[PDB]
Design a protein around this ligand. Sequence first.
Ligand SMILES: Nc1ncnc2c1ncn2[C@H]1C[C@H](O)[C@@H](COP(=O)(O)OP(=O)(O)OP(=O)(O)O)O1
Ligand SMILES: Nc1ncnc2c1ncn2[C@H]1C[C@H](O)[C@@H](COP(=O)(O)OP(=O)(O)OP(=O)(O)O)O1
Ligand SMILES: [Mg+2]
Ligand SMILES: [Mg+2]
Ligand code: NA
Lengths: 171, 171
Amino acid sequence: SMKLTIPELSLVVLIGSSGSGKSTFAKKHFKPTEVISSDFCRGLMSDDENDQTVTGAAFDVLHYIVSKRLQLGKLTVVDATNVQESARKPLIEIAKDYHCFPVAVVFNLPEKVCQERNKNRTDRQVEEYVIRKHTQQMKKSIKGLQREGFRYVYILNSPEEVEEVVFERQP
Amino acid sequence: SMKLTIPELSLVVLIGSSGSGKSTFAKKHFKPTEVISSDFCRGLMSDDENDQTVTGAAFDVLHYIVSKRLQLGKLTVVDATNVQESARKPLIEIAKDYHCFPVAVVFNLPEKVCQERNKNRTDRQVEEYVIRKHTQQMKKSIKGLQREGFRYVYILNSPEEVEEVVFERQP
Ligand SMILES: Nc1ncnc2c1ncn2[C@H]1C[C@H](O)[C@@H](COP(=O)(O)OP(=O)(O)OP(=O)(O)O)O1
Ligand SMILES: Nc1ncnc2c1ncn2[C@H]1C[C@H](O)[C@@H](COP(=O)(O)OP(=O)(O)OP(=O)(O)O)O1
Ligand SMILES: [Mg+2]
Ligand SMILES: [Mg+2]
Ligand code: NA
C-alpha cells in the first residue's frame, strides 16, 4: 500500500482533472460529511445540474463551509479540480488561518485515462478540451505545490498507485 | 520559510549530487552524531582518499551503523549522494525494519550550481563528470521516491528554498 500520512486536523485538497477520479477517491477514503465538493455547492445555488451560471457563488459557499468546518476543528476534504493556483491559494490561506495543515493529493494520471473514463460517466460529462486543459494545468502545478504552502504533497502517478492508497491519520 | 515536518524517529535521506550542499545542510540542521556520511564510513576503511575497492565495505558499514542507531530509536540522517535507487533501497528497508519513517530530502539544484561549488571547494573536489552523472540520476529519481517507500518526499528546487528550510519534529 501507498501510505499517505495526514494529521487528524487537516485540509485535504484533491487536485485533478475532471474524470481523474477525485470524488470516487473521496467516497472510498473519507466520511461523507468530511468531503465538500464544488458540485454540491453549485447544487445549493441551483436545482439545475452542474449549472455554470452560479460558479462564483458555488466556490464562495465552498470556501465558507470549509472555513467553518476548520473553525470547529474538523478534518475537511476539498473535492474540486484545484488545478489552478487561484483555486488552491484561498484554501491554503483558510488552512493557515485555522492552524491546519493543508495537504495536496495529486491525481497525476495520463490525460487519456481521464478522457476515457469521461466518455463512460453516467452523471455528467465534459468536452475533451476541458480534460486536456485540466491535465496541462495539473502537470504545471506539481513542482510548486510545496512552495505554495502544502505541508505534505502526495503525487499519485498511476491508477494502481491511486488504488493502493491508504491514509494514516496522526493525532 | 519552508517548513518540513519530520517524525521524532525518522531516517532522513539526503539526496543530491556532489557539491549540492548536503553536508553543509546536515551540519546546519542536525546534531553531528545524528549524521552518518559515506565519507566518514570510507575513512574507517582507508586513510587513502582515492580508494575504490573500499566502497562496498563502507556502504555495508554505513547501513549497519544506521541500523543500530534506528534500532536504538535515534533519528539518523544519511549524508551520501543517494542518487541511485540501489543506494536508497537498503535504507528504506532499514527504516521499515525498525518501524521508522524514511524521509527524502532532495537537492533539486541545477548542475551548474553544483559544478561551481565543486570548483570552489578547498577541502576535496570531484571531477566534473561525476556531478553531471549525479544530477541526471537525481533528476530521474524524483518522480519515483514516494513509490520507493519514502513516507514524506521534500523536493528543494533552488538555493533559496534550501536556505529557507526549517525542520519541524512533531510526530
Ligand atoms: N479507479 C478507477 N477505476 C475505474 N474507473 C474509475 C476510477 N475512479 C473513477 N472512475 C470512474 C467513475 C466515473 O464514471 C468517472 C469519473 O470519476 P469521478 O470520481 O467522478 O471523477 P472526478 O470527481 O475527478 O471528476 P469531476 O472533477 O468532473 O467531478 O471515472
Ligand atoms: N547553500 C550554499 N551556498 C553557497 N555555497 C555552498 C552552499 N552549500 C554548500 N556550499 C559550498 C560549500 C562547500 O565548499 C561546497 C560543497 O558543499 P558540501 O556541503 O560539501 O556538498 P556535499 O556534501 O553535497 O558534497 P559531497 O557529496 O561531495 O560530499 O559548496
Ligand atoms: Mg467529482
Ligand atoms: Mg558531503
Ligand atoms: Na544549508
